[PDB]
Design a protein around this ligand. Structure first.
Ligand code: CLA
Ligand code: CLA
Ligand code: CLA
Ligand code: CLA
Ligand code: CLA
Ligand code: CLA
Ligand code: CLA
Ligand SMILES: CCCCCCCCCCCCCCCC(=O)OC[C@H](COP(=O)(O)OC[C@@H](O)CO)OC(=O)CCCCCCCCCCCCCCC
Ligand SMILES: CC1=C(/C=C/C(C)=C/C=C/C(C)=C/C=C/C=C(C)/C=C/C=C(C)/C=C/C2=C(C)CCCC2(C)C)C(C)(C)CCC1
Ligand SMILES: CC1=C(/C=C/C(C)=C/C=C/C(C)=C/C=C/C=C(C)/C=C/C=C(C)/C=C/C2=C(C)CCCC2(C)C)C(C)(C)CCC1
Ligand SMILES: CC1=C(C/C=C(\C)CCC[C@H](C)CCC[C@H](C)CCCC(C)C)C(=O)c2ccccc2C1=O
Ligand code: SF4
Ligand code: SF4
Lengths: 63, 40, 143, 140, 161, 80, 741, 31
């Protein structure tokens, strides 16, 4: 939604579904999932980052 | 007893063993002083 | 020295040319066994194998059978051998039916006609061998 | 490259093993892997044992594409040999060139490759099984 | 009294159980001589057995046909000491424990390294949380009313239905 | 044979292909991803189903996904 | 040259890495993100080679860990001696060994456990022990409690010295890999210096302190009047009074008139009639001869001086036509890899523990230990279990060597390569042997059950229907019985009375007896062979197929312990050599369980018991083994059901602790089945539901909880299974034997 | 009658199930 913002994930299949994450990067064109949300709660694989689209995120607190 | 050794004593297993030791001792002393309490 | 080399000069086939596998004794005995002997028809292969197995099959039933300590011990042993041989030839026939479904070559154990000749040889040979061993065991006092 | 093999290359020096093909690579399908080495040197076969890859050309027979690929990974990550080619040999002696199909390893993109098995939506958007009940399709 | 059971003080089977245990202890007493540590320990033990049986008789416990105390857990205040008062005591203690744990977790989640704080406990504040959890029923009620206890579910991870 | 599929959540990090021990997967050009590449499975018949691609996939859920199905000599990985 | 070379102050002494929990590994040093981190911290704790690449550092860590372990063992010897000193009835037992039950543990009265201080004789209340330490001390010559107290203090001093040595040899002066790899000097010093001088010193101790004290005790002198060991050590007149050869001094030793010492250095054999144990003069001669043998053996390998052997050359010289290069490379393998050495050493240690179990019961070495039936059973069973565990550890570390330290450049065309090149033949043939052996050995039992249930005893594989006599074992027993005259003329008695001879008995109870071997012994011995062969099948297959297999050509890449390689190829479950060990531990558990059951029933029915004045031999179970051990029904009835009475009826008595442990071990054995049968996916989903419940309350932990890994679940199930089964057998045997014997 | 156990039990529990096993094996090994 905006870089450095806290956003709630709304993707149903996400490990972080209905949980907050910090946006680190939003890309230009191209990527169907431009936003890059960084979490602190590692999923089962171990990664704490994932790419989401703008529609799959809802801001809770701004930078 | 440097800050590092205090940190090590503050680690989870040492603290678990210490607290459960104190708890078991408390229960056992309550048993010695008020034994066979199948009631209140 | 080196008595274990590749099988047929092929290091990548899953085998080794050990003395047990590739010695002249092993080659001679195996190649001269009826199932491998050169020139024997499938009927004779089955016949030799049948008599061979039928001669020895009676023995366990005769001595260790339930009626070993009975006057009809050898009769019961022969009947048990006949039953076991019946099961074995049934197994042979169903194996031929399941394996060599579509075949017309014949004169080959890996074909339907050849395996049927082999099974007939085995069946008759094993019945005769059980009976022959019965006859010998009745008159074992001769030796 | 091409669907052909010399079928006469000198093979690695190996003392034989029990891990090789058994009455099925000659009836259904065998596999071959051919590479080139700068020095004659020792390596570990996918089948249990140790062999000596020769100087220059080397050819090996195996029973599994997995075995060939495992040997290939060994060659790449130990001896830095990255010219290997993998073939599938049928009982009718047809030879099919399989792994470096475009001449380059699959991990590096090429301009001519077309996509096979690509879905245009996220993983969590497939139809339910009840939708495809009593139909020949599947939910992917 | 209830359930066909009788008070343990007026229970012939209870008295026989006491007498039988006493006779067993006195029978094993024969091996040891007067004044030895084993003899004195057995004397203490038999005194303890008699005191235990007398205490059960005096407490008002009900003894069945088997001659053992049977605890009546139905909520009658005549037998409150069997379950109701121990039940309240445990509920208070367990609430203390859980409140200490939860409050320390709330503290640690705001720490710069919550993952390391989970293993290495900050003991100076852990003791404070443990002490302050003595008044958990009012603290939990306060958090309930202010809405800081139950996170809205619209904020908890949930598997695709 | 097993069915291998790739979804557009691919980021083109080319790790499934390296984890592949049967050369089932391969990177092909793609407009969607920033890296310009997407995994694809043109040789699904050689799939065995060890799911090393799924293990190596770093997406929150797997861009590369394998469904086990009809079995074969290759899929069973029998040397005989 | 062989030389001492060490680095000084290699590691500082600080608690900072105590505070940092997962410092040892790169991945664990980051900190936790899931609860699997916590488990991995323990799992990879002593995996030094995964932590550091340097073989020198690995060797230093191992050396100091050995020191720490020796400190623990010295503290354990100290606990035994100190408890015997203080909380025991050792003096009463020493006065009256046969009637006094040995006890060296006392519970405190808190919650009614004081009953566990049962009547153990001697005016002492306590928990009966079954470790044989009382008999050990009587053999050693300890007659007072001050000696036990002071040796306990010495053991504590040695434990402190060992902790200091472990700290010093890692933090102040750590050796180098050049020092560690001096295998020749290590063998020389361990043979001549450790074993040889240990045996020599023990022989001296026996000859000077144990023979006189034990002879006087057997004569009848009470412990108070016994002259003290320091008096005996130098009083040559008293030692001449007891053993006349001592008056000749050491001249008959220095001159080769060794026959003068025949009185206190003997080859009598058999068992002492008084104590019903081995002659201590025989034991002294034994240890002296072994000291000489080991000192002779320890001068074989090369050192700074020109003489000696090189194990490299010895190995390289052994190569045959069917073996190619032969043993080439094995010296380098065993000098470079610690896991190979660990594998060999664990295998030999376990086999030695089993051999110890077999030898001690047949030749009771300590006085009044044969009559102490709980001690014999406990020691035999314990050493059997330790042996099985050590053997499986050997297999595991062989697999670890194969996965990690194997290299074809080194091991090309040697025995290891040639073994790997026909592993398929090896495992297939062992598979056939296992099927054949199990089919015959167990189907004989099943046949016996079938015919008994069909009411056909004449068709049994019994001693009177169809006999399967162990003719070869009977022949060997006869040869051993006739040995003392013909093939061992200087021996005055058989090595063990189990083979044959007289019935040794102390008081009424029987110390040793000839053990007959019949159809039941044949059947159970072939059962033992079947179980051993299946265990070897599992373990050897795990070791051989650790590198790769027809299913996974690249199994070495995945690692030593890994869960699987996916559901592909129809399923690649438990392909790892670790999982092979996990399965082989069940099988050695079954093997040792059947072995100890055979031991218990056979000794209770045919050996242990009582003999009256006339000679009425009455056994504990009454010789029912020979006729009831032919069926699994008989095994279930006359051994488990029959002997479980003393366990189950133990409530309200001193063995009620054994009853409680019986139940608890049953519970843990069953609890293990949860982990053994279930899988991580269900448990992770259940944890997800619980985590939702916690997150709803704002208390989901920062360290996210996860179900245990697959390998960890298998390990936990195996550990609980082994603990439950072993504890069940432990409580059952101890309660039964203490109650009846 | 008391004849029939002897006639029927072995016919039905050795011959028929053996033939059924043979038939099932032969059928499942078709094509
Ligand atoms: C399912 C029912 C049932 C069961 C469990 C049995 C069991 C038995 N019968 Mg049988 N029997 C049955 C029904 C059944 N019978 C019926 C209805 C009749 C006709 C009135 C008979 C007539 C009969 C005779 C005359 C004799 C037996 C005997 C026996 C015994 C030997 C087996 C044998 O060869 O019998 C089978 C014999 C037959 C002639 C075939 C009967 C066919 C039945 C009805 C088939 C039912 C199939 C079932 C519902 C499902 C499929 C089973 C399977 C394919 C999975 C055995 C205890 C023998 C005996 O007494 O031994 C001590 C004997 O001599 N039975
Ligand atoms: C547990 C199972 C079992 C049992 C109980 C028996 C029981 C019997 N076997 Mg044996 N047998 C068995 C397994 C068993 N067999 C197996 C597995 C084989 C194959 C390896 C044989 C092969 C076999 C043969 C070939 C013969 C027996 C015979 C006998 C009888 C011996 C008693 C007797 O009459 O002495 C009389 C004993 C003799 C007359 C001596 C027979 C010795 C044979 C010829 C051995 C081979 C000799 C020599 C090495 C051959 C070289 C090769 C040539 C081409 C008896 C019925 C003998 C028989 O039928 O007696 C009439 C007999 O000739 N058995
Ligand atoms: C911090 C403490 C804490 C708190 C407040 C809760 C709270 C809860 N747990 Mg529990 N739980 C805890 C720790 C805690 N858990 C731990 C460490 C584990 C792992 C063993 C579990 C495993 C667990 C499971 C598997 C389940 C619950 C359930 C529940 C719920 C019902 C209460 C119950 O039956 O507890 C049960 C309690 C236990 C099984 C053992 C608790 C362990 C100890 C005794 C307490 C920990 C105290 C901690 C060390 C304090 C440190 C603070 C200090 C530094 C100041 C509730 C949401 C159930 C649920 O979902 O119900 C809706 C449920 O199914 N919990
Ligand atoms: C006579 C000389 C001598 C003696 C007595 C020992 C004794 C011992 N060595 Mg050895 N060792 C020697 C020479 C000697 N070593 C030499 C020359 C080298 C260099 C090549 C080594 C290199 C070496 C290594 C690398 C290791 C040992 C270890 C051991 C212990 C083996 C375990 C055991 O059974 O302990 C029996 C223990 C006792 C009998 C108690 C006695 C304790 C002291 C000596 C008093 C043991 C204490 C192992 C270890 O560290 O264990 C702690 C070990 O890993 N030694
Ligand atoms: C390592 C094992 C060991 C040890 C330590 C000993 C020790 C002893 N044996 Mg030997 N012995 C052994 C094995 C051993 N033996 C074996 C295996 C055999 C069987 C072959 C024998 C057979 C044997 C016999 C048959 C005899 C001995 C005897 C002796 C004494 C010899 C004294 C001597 O030579 O002084 C050596 C002296 C020196 C090296 C010079 C230094 C002297 C120092 C400074 C003196 C210190 C004295 C002390 C600390 C204080 C004592 C004071 C006193 C008032 C209490 C001594 C007690 C004799 C004895 O006394 O028997 C009871 C004897 O007759 N032994
Ligand atoms: C000389 C003996 C010896 C030595 C030096 C080693 C050394 C090693 N083993 Mg081990 N091992 C041994 C014997 C030995 N082993 C035996 C006898 C077995 C057979 C069971 C094994 C089986 C084995 C396996 C299968 C593996 C190892 C591994 C290892 C390495 C890491 C172990 C670790 O960090 O554990 C740290 C310690 C623990 C995790 C604690 C273990 C606790 C156990 C399971 C339960 C204890 C129960 C207790 C006694 C009773 C409880 C009572 C109850 C009432 C409370 C290390 C090199 C691992 C390795 O090399 O991986 C690459 C590995 O995978 N070992
Ligand atoms: C009682 C339980 C049981 C049984 C019967 C078996 C059986 C077997 N296990 Mg074991 N196993 C067990 C528990 C058991 N296991 C458990 C709990 C585990 C988990 C730890 C394992 C793990 C395990 C492994 C990992 C391995 C084995 C192996 C084996 C085989 C040993 C060879 C053998 O003796 O076969 C012979 C068969 C028997 C002893 C059973 C009885 C046979 C008699 C003669 C009856 C015959 C009946 C008749 C002919 C047919 C039916 C009649 C009618 C209905 C038609 C065999 C299949 C090893 C193997 O592969 O061996 C080659 C092996 O590698 N097992
Ligand atoms: C039971 C298995 C016997 C068959 C497998 C043994 C095959 C075998 O190991 O190869 C033969 C091998 C001897 O081989 P060489 O003499 O080539 O090897 C001697 C080695 O010590 C030098 O490396 O072992 C024996 O002779 C044991 C014979 C069984 C006793
Ligand atoms: C190699 C060897 C071996 C083995 C051996 C064997 C295995 C043997 C066998 C043997 C035998 C096993 C023999 C047999 C014989 C036979 C016989 C003697 C037969 C006869 C038959 C007959 C006479 C028939 C006839 C008939 C009839 C009656 C009817 C019609 C048809 C017919 C014509 C067929 C051993 C290890 C020892 C040693 C080393 C070497
Ligand atoms: C002379 C004689 C004889 C014969 C004998 C024989 C025939 C023998 C054989 C023998 C043999 C046949 C032997 C063998 C041996 C072996 C060994 C000794 C082995 C060892 C091994 C090892 C040491 C290993 C180790 C390891 C492991 C375990 C794991 C990992 C890897 C390694 C390698 C490290 C008779 C009887 C006639 C009598 C007269 C005389
Ligand atoms: C019960 C069980 C669990 C759940 C059990 C777990 C996570 C163990 C819990 C241990 C903690 C540390 C509690 C110990 C007691 C104190 C409350 C702390 C698994 O995760 C699992 C994983 C793989 C195979 C089988 C199983 C399995 O059987
Ligand atoms: S998400 Fe998976 S398929 Fe896509 S690039 Fe990464 S590893 Fe390859
Ligand atoms: S259950 Fe375990 S062993 Fe079986 S396929 Fe799944 S991960 Fe592999």
């Amino acid at each position: 939604i905006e870089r450095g913002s806290k956003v709630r994930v709304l993707r149903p299949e996400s490990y972080w579904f209905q949980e907050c994450g910090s946006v680190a990067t939003i890309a230009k064109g191209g990527d169907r999932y431009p936003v890059v949300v960084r979490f602190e709660k590692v999923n089962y694989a171990g990664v704490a980052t994932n790419n989401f689209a703008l529609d799959e995120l809802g801001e809770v607190e701004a930078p | 007893m440097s800050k590092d050794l205090l940190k090590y004593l503050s680690t989870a297993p040492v603290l678990l063993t210490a607290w459960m030791s104190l708890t078991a001792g408390m229960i056992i002393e309550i048993q010695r002083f008020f034994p066979d309490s199948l009631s209140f | 020295s080196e008595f274990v080399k590749p099988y047929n000069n092929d290091p990548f086939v899953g085998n080794l040319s050990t003395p047990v596998t590739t010695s002249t004794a092993t080659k001679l005995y195996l190649g001269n066994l009826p199932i491998y002997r050169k020139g024997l028809s499938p009927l004779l292969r089955g016949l030799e194998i049948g008599m061979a197995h039928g001669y020895f099959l009676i023995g366990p039933f005769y001595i260790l059978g339930p009626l070993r300590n009975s006057p009809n011990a050898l009769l019961v042993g022969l009947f048990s051998a006949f039953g076991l041989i019946l099961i074995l030839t049934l197994g042979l026939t169903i194996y031929g039916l399941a394996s060599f479904q579509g075949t017309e070559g014949g004169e080959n154990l890996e074909s339907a006609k050849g395996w049927r000749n082999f099974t007939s040889g085995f069946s008759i040979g094993a019945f005769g061998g059980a009976s022959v061993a019965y006859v010998l065991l009745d008159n074992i006092s001769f030796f | 490259t091409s669907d052909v093999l010399n079928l006469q290359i000198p093979t690695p020096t190996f003392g034989g093993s029990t891990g090789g093909w058994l009455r099925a690579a000659e009836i259904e399908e065998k596999y071959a892997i051919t590479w080139t080495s700068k020095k004659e040197q020792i390596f570990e076969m996918p089948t249990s044992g140790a062999a000596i890859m020769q100087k220059g050309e080397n050819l090996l027979y195996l029973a599994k594409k997995e075995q060939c690929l495992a040997l290939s990974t060994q060659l790449r990550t130990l001896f830095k040999i990255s010219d290997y080619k993998i073939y599938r040999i049928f009982p009718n002696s047809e030879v099919q060139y399989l792994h470096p199909k475009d001449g380059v390893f699959p991990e590096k993109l090429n301009e001519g490759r077309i996509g096979v098995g690509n879905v245009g939506y996220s993983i969590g958007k497939n139809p339910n099984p009840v939708n495809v009940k009593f139909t020949g399709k599947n939910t992917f | 009294d209830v359930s066909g059971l009788t008070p343990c003080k007026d229970s012939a089977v209870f008295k026989k159980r006491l007498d039988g245990s006493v006779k067993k202890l006195q029978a094993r007493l024969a091996n040891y001589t007067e004044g030895t540590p084993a003899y004195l320990a057995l004397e203490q033990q038999i005194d303890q057995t008699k005191a235990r049986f007398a205490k059960y008789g005096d407490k008002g416990l009900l003894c069945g046909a088997d001659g053992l105390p049977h605890l009546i857990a139905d909520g009658r205040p005549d037998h409150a000491g069997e379950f109701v008062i121990p039940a309240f005591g445990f509920l208070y203690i367990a609430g203390w424990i859980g409140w200490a744990g939860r409050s320390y977790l709330q503290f640690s989640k705001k720490t710069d390294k919550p993952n390391e704080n989970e293993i290495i406990i900050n003991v100076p504040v852990a003791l404070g949380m443990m002490s302050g959890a003595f008044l958990w029923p009012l603290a939990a009620w306060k958090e309930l009313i202010n809405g800081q206890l139950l996170v809205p579910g619209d904020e908890v991870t949930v598997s695709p239905r | 044979s097993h069915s291998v599929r790739v979804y557009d959540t691919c980021i083109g990090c080319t790790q499934c292909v390296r984890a592949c021990p049967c050369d089932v997967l391969e990177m092909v050009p793609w407009d969607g991803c920033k890296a310009g590449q997407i995994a694809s499975a043109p040789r699904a018949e050689d799939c065995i189903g060890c799911k090393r691609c799924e293990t190596a996939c770093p997406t929150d859920f797997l861009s590369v996904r394998v469904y086990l199905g009809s079995e074969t000599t290759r899929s069973l990985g029998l040397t005989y | 040259k062989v030389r001492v070379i060490v680095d000084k102050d290699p590691v500082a002494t600080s608690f900072e890495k105590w505070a940092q929990p997962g410092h040892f590994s790169r991945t664990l040093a980051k900190g936790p993100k899931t609860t699997t981190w916590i488990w991995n911290l323990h799992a990879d704790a002593h995996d030094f080679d995964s932590q550091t690449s340097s073989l020198e550092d690995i060797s230093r860590k191992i050396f100091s860990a050995h020191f720490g372990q020796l400190a623990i063992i010295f503290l354990w010897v100290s606990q035994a001696y100190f408890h015997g000193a203080r909380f025991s009835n050792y003096s009463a037992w020493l006065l009256n060994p046969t009637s006094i039950k040995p006890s060296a543990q006392v519970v405190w009265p808190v919650v009614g456990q004081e009953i566990l201080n049962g009547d153990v004789g001697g005016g002492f209340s306590g928990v009966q022990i079954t470790s044989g330490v009382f008999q050990m001390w009587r053999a050693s010559g300890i007659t007072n409690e001050t000696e036990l107290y002071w040796t306990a203090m010495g053991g504590l001093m040695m434990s402190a010295l060992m902790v200091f040595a472990g700290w010093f040899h890692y933090h102040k002066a750590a050796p180098k890999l050049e020092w560690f790899q001096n295998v020749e000097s290590m063998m020389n010093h361990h043979l001549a210096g450790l074993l040889g001088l240990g045996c020599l010193s023990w022989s001296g101790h026996q000859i000077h302190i144990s023979l006189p004290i034990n002879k006087l005790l057997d004569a009848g002198v009470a412990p108070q009047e016994i002259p003290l060991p320091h008096e005996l050590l130098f009083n040559q007149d008293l030692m001449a009074q007891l053993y006349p050869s001592f008056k000749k001094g050491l001249l008959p030793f220095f001159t080769l008139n060794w026959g003068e010492y025949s009185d206190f250095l003997t080859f009598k054999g058999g068992l002492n009639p008084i104590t019903g144990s081995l002659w201590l003069s025989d034991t002294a001669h034994h240890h002296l001869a072994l000291a000489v043998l080991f000192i002779f053996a320890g001068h074989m390998y090369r050192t700074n001086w020109g003489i000696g052997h090189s194990m490299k050359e010895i190995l390289e010289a052994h190569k045959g036509p069917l073996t190619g290069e032969g043993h080439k490379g094995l010296y380098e393998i065993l000098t470079t890899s610690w896991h190979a050495q660990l594998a060999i050493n664990l295998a030999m240690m376990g086999s030695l523990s089993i051999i110890v179990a077999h030898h001690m019961y047949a030749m009771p070495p300590y006085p009044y230990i044969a009559v102490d039936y709980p001690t014999q059973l406990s020691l035999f069973t314990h050493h059997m279990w330790i042996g099985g565990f050590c053997v499986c550890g050997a297999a595991a570390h062989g697999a670890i060597f194969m996965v990690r330290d194997y290299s074809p450049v080194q091991s090309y065309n040697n025995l290891l390569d040639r073994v790997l090149r026909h592993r398929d033949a090896i495992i297939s043939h062992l598979n056939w042997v296992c099927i054949f052996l199990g089919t015959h050995s167990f189907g004989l039992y099943i046949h016996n059950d079938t015919m008994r249930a069909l009411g056909r005893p004449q068709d049994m594989f019994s001693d009177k229907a169809i006999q399967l006599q162990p003719i070869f074992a009977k022949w060997v027993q006869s040869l051993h019985t006739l040995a003392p005259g013909n093939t061992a003329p200087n021996s005055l008695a058989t090595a063990s009375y189990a083979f044959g001879g007289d019935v040794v008995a102390v008081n009424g109870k029987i110390a040793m007896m000839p053990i007959q071997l019949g159809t039941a012994d044949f059947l159970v011995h072939h059962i033992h062979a079947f179980t051993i062969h299946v265990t070897v099948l599992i373990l050897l297959k795990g070791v051989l197929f650790a590198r790769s297999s027809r299913l996974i050509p690249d199994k070495a890449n995945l690692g030593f312990r890994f869960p699987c390689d996916g559901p592909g190829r129809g399923g690649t479950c438990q392909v790892s050599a670790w999982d092979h060990i996990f399965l082989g531990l069940f099988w050695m558990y079954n093997c040792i369980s059947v072995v100890i059951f055979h031991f218990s029933w056979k000794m209770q029915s045919d050996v242990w018991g009582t003999i009256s004045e006339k000679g009425k031999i009455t056994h504990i179970t009454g010789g029912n083994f020979a006729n009831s051990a032919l069926t699994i029904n008989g095994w279930l009835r006359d051994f488990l059901w029959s002997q479980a009475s003393q366990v189950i009826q133990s409530y309200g008595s001193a063995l009620s602790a054994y009853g409680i442990i019986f139940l608890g071990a049953h519970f843990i054995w069953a609890f293990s089945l949860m982990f053994l049968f279930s899988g991580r996916g269900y448990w992770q989903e259940l944890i997800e539901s619980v985590v939702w419940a916690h997150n709803k309350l704002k208390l989901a932990p920062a360290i996210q909880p996860r179900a245990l890994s697959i390998t960890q679940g298998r390990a936990v199930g195996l550990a609980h299974y082994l603990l439950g089964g072993i504890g069940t057998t432990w409580s059952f045997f101890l309660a039964r034997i203490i109650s009846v014997g | 009658a008391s004849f029939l156990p002897s006639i029927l039990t072995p016919v039905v529990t050795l011959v028929f199930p053996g033939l059924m096993f043979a038939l099932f094996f032969v059928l499942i090994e078709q094509e």
